[PDB]
Amino acid sequence: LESSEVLQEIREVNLAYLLLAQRLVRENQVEAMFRLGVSKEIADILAKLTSAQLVKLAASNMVLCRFRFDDHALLSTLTHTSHDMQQIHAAILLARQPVES
Amino acid sequence: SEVLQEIREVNLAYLLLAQRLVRENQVEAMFRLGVSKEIADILAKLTSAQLVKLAASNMVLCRFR
Amino acid sequence: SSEVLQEIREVNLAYLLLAQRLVRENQVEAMFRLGVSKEIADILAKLTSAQLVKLAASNMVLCRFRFDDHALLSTLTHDMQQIHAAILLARQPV
Amino acid sequence: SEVLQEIREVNLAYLLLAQRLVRENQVEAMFRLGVSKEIADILAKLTSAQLVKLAASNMVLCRFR
Amino acid sequence: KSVLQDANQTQLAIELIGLGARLQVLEAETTLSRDRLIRLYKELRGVSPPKGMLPFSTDWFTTWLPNIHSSLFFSAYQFMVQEGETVGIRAVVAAYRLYLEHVSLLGGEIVLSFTRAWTLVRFFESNMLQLSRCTCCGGQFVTHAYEPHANFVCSLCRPP
Amino acid sequence: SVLQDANQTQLAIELIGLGARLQVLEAETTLSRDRLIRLYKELRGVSPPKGMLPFSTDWFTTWLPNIHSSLFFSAYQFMVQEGETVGIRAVVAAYRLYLEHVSLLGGEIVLSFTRAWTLVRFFESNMLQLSRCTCCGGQFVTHAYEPHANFVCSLCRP
Ligand SMILES: [Zn+2]
Ligand SMILES: [Zn+2]
Numbered sequence: 001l002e003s004s005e006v007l008q009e010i011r012e013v014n015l016a017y018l019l020l021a022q023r024l025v026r027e028n029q030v031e032a033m034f035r036l037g038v039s040k041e042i043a044d045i046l047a048k049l050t051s052a053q054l055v056k057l058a059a060s061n062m063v064l065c066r067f068r069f070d071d072h073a074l075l076s077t078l079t080h081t082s083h084d085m086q087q088i089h090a091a092i093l094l095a096r097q098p099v100e101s
Numbered sequence: 102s103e104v105l106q107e108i109r110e111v112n113l114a115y116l117l118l119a120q121r122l123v124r125e126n127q128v129e130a131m132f133r134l135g136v137s138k139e140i141a142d143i144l145a146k147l148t149s150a151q152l153v154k155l156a157a158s159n160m161v162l163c164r165f166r
Numbered sequence: 167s168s169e170v171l172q173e174i175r176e177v178n179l180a181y182l183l184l185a186q187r188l189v190r191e192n193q194v195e196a197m198f199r200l201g202v203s204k205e206i207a208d209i210l211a212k213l214t215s216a217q218l219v220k221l222a223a224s225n226m227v228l229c230r231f232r233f234d235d236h237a238l239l240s241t242l243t244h245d246m247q248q249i250h251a252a253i254l255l256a257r258q259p260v
Numbered sequence: 261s262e263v264l265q266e267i268r269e270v271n272l273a274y275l276l277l278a279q280r281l282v283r284e285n286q287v288e289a290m291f292r293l294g295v296s297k298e299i300a301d302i303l304a305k306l307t308s309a310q311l312v313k314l315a316a317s318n319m320v321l322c323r324f325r
Numbered sequence: 326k327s328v329l330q331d332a333n334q335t336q337l338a339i340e341l342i343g344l345g346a347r348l349q350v351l352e353a354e355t356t357l358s359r360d361r362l363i364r365l366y367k368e369l370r371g372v373s374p375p376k377g378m379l380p381f382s383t384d385w386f387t388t389w390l391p392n393i394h395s396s397l398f399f400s401a402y403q404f405m406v407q408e409g410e411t412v413g414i415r416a417v418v419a420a421y422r423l424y425l426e427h428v429s430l431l432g433g434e435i436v437l438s439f440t441r442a443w444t445l446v447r448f449f450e451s452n453m454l455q456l457s458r459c460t461c462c463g464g465q466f467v468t469h470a471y472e473p474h475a476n477f478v479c480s481l482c483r484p485p
Numbered sequence: 486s487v488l489q490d491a492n493q494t495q496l497a498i499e500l501i502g503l504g505a506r507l508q509v510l511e512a513e514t515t516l517s518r519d520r521l522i523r524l525y526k527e528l529r530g531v532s533p534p535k536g537m538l539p540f541s542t543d544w545f546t547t548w549l550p551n552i553h554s555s556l557f558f559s560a561y562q563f564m565v566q567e568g569e570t571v572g573i574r575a576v577v578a579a580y581r582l583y584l585e586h587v588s589l590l591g592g593e594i595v596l597s598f599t600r601a602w603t604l605v606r607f608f609e610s611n612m613l614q615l616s617r618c619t620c621c622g623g624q625f626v627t628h629a630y631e632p633h634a635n636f637v638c639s640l641c642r643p
Contacts, residue, residue: 001125001126001129002122002125002126002129002133006121006122006125009118009121010118012114012215012216012219013114013115013118015215015218015219016110016111016114016214016215016216017111017115017161017163017165019183019215020107020108020111020161020215021161021165023104023107023190024104024108024161026190026191027104030405030409030410030411030419031419031422031423033404033408033409034160034401034404034405034409034423035108035159035160035161036161036164036165037160037161037164038164038165039408040408040409040410042165048262050265050266050269051179051180051181051183051184051187051266051269051270052176052180052269052270052273054183055176055179055180055183062133063118063122063133063134063135064165064166065115065163065164065165066134066135066136066163066164066165066166067119067134067135067136067140067162067163068161068162068163068164069140069162070136070137070140071463072137072139072140072142072143074462074463075140075143076143077462077482078155079143079147079151079154079155083481083484085393085431085481086154087154087157087158087430087431088393088394088397088427088431088481089462089464089481090155090158090160091158091159091160091397091400091427092396092397092400092464092465092466092481093462093463093464094160095160095397095400095401095403095404096400096403096464096465099408100164100165102429105426105429105430107214109430110214157430158427158430159423159426159427159430170280170281170284173277173280174277174292176273177273177274177277180270180273181270181274181320181322181324184266184267184270184320185320185324187266188263188320191263194564194568194569194570194578195578195581195582197563197567197568198319198560198563198564198568198582199267199318199319199320200320200323200324201319201320201323202323202324203567204567204569206324226292227277227292227293227294228324228325229274229322229323229324230293230294230322230323230324230325231274231278231293231294231295231299231321231322232320232321232322232323233299233321234296234299235622236296236298236299236301236302238621238622239299239302240302242314243302243306243310243313243314246552246590246640247313248313248316248317248589248590249552249553249556249586249590249640250621250623250640251314251317251319252317252318252319252556252559252586253555253556253559253623253624253625254621254622254623255319256319256556256559256560256562256563257559257562257623257624260567261588264585264588264589316589317589318582318585318586318588318589327527328494328520328523328524328527329498329524329527329528332491332494332495332498335487335491336491336495339488339491361487364487365487365488368486368487368488369488
């Protein structure tokens with residue numbers, strides 16, 4: 001059923017990700033790879049995208065990103081109403097998660 | 102700290118969109134988002150406070166094709 | 167109308183993306199290339215993603231040409247023509 | 261030198277767009293582009309080689325309100 | 326005796342002082358004289374170095390709250406060497422920068438001093454501390470040397 | 486002061502990287518004359534060029550250099566006037582942009598950093614002038630006390 005307003009939110013999210021990804025890689029390549037969980041090869045691609053390249057990729061009408069959590073058992077315990085270190089806890093797991101090449 | 106603020110904003114942006122997608126049409130959103138049903142069910146049942154606390158990290162919460 | 171608004175909206179965004187990239191990289195150097203005041207350049211660095219999209223699809227050309235003298239422009243586009251244009255634009259006010 | 265390419269490409273995009281606008285409807289393009297008739301006439305009569313050599317600068321060829 | 330070599334070492338020395346490195350960490354990772362660092366530290370920060378000796382104790386890094394910060398910090402350091410292709414003190418610093426980055430969100434005080442962070446790396450480099458994978462969540466935390474796995478549960482999955 | 490020494494040595498490397506001559510370093514840094522030579526010998530393969538500071542205005546009115554100098558200065562002028570950065574910092578940031586512009590034309594670097602730094606000190610001492618072109622309107626360099634109302638830039642009429 002998705003179209004009209006929904007497609008507007010999809011294209012906006014894709015752009016915001018790419019803008020952050022380039023801002024992260026440009027400031028520091030290695031630090032960016034850590035946050036995005038992405039290989040050195042891809043980071044070179046994201047930083048090297050020009051303004052016109054971004055417009056094309058941004059408004060693809062498709063969900064460019066995929067979720068970084070695939071274990072429902074982990075997600076429920078991570079986001080549960082008890083120690084509140086859930087924010088720190090998620091960082092340790094996502095750090096060991098492999099990059100994408 | 103501006104870098105952190107944008108990271109926190111993008112995470113919440115993704116979570117809000119995935120949540121709306123799953124809530125409107127789960128069978129199709131799981132396909133569009135490439136996510137399992139059990140995760141799709143978790144996303145739908147997340148409160149606004151949970152989405153903030155989940156998004157408030159120094160790491161980007163979604164990868165890329 | 168119709169298709170033209172896609173090219174207008176695309177160009178408006180593409181300019182804004184360049185302005186932020188230049189200002190974030192170096193404020194003073196960006197002001198020089200964009201010929202824009204310190205106040206405006208500072209604004210561009212702080213603009214968020216959604217804020218840019220709104221201005222992009224305004225159906226109006228947000229940017230304006232930096233040449234208003236046809237006599238200079240015509241002579242400009244006829245081998246140092248590239249160098250000459252830089253000296254003129256540098257003195258142009260913000 | 262990558263910064264030069266983004267500057268050259270945006271410039272060429274503006275010139276290509278302004279040329280396409282003026283060529284379709286000069287009276288109507290002058291409104292949206294905020295340009296005089298004399299400049300619009302020059303923009304229409306520019307070749308692709310002229311537009312490139314004009315756009316190949318280290319400065320952005322259009323400002324902003 | 327290279328002038329450039331001296332410029333880089335002094336450059337590195339200021340970086341560590343900004344992160345709160347103790348005197349000993351400076352002597353280890355720079356070729357600068359012990360006396361020159363004191364003038365540098367006195368120039369950077371108001372007073373002279375704390376004169377306290379290096380901790381080198383593993384009991385601290387197994388307390389639950391420090392274990393969290395260290396197991397978190399190391400996961401960044403591990404990534405820096407494994408996939409970041411950056412090793413040495415540079416890798417140690419870049420990980421601490423992210424650790425500090427993550428601290429701001431929680432709002433708590435920085436529990437891992439840069440010296441303790443640098444101490445942790447020398448502990449792992451010297452095979453005195455080990456990484457155990459959590460049976461429940463799967464995240465790898467720091468534990469004592471030669472402690473057995475297959476029965477491990479992390480501090481986050483099961484606090485005291 | 487050790488910090489005072491660290492920044493000056495770091496600045497010296499920047500200038501050596503830009504091709505500054507020995508004297509330019511001595512003027513804008515607190516390092517010893519001999520230390521610069523050891524530093525210059527470490528960065529670049531050879532010792533300093535041993536050539537003395539140029540300081541002559543006949544060069545900057547020559548057909549090709551007048552172009553490059555008038556372009557470089559118009560960038561420099563923006564750095565001080567509206568860029569809110571003055572001093573040796575202003576000189577370097579302008580030269581970086583000048584070099585940037587060379588890449589497009591593809592020609593050889595006609596204005597060395599030393600001549601660029603010399604040009605700025607010439608203006609600081611009111612020995613060189615900026616005349617606005619009657620035809621194009623861009624401001625180029627001319628001799629001190631040169632008359633206007635008959636000025637035409639090198640580009641409008643070679
Ligand atoms: Zn666990
Ligand atoms: Zn002229």
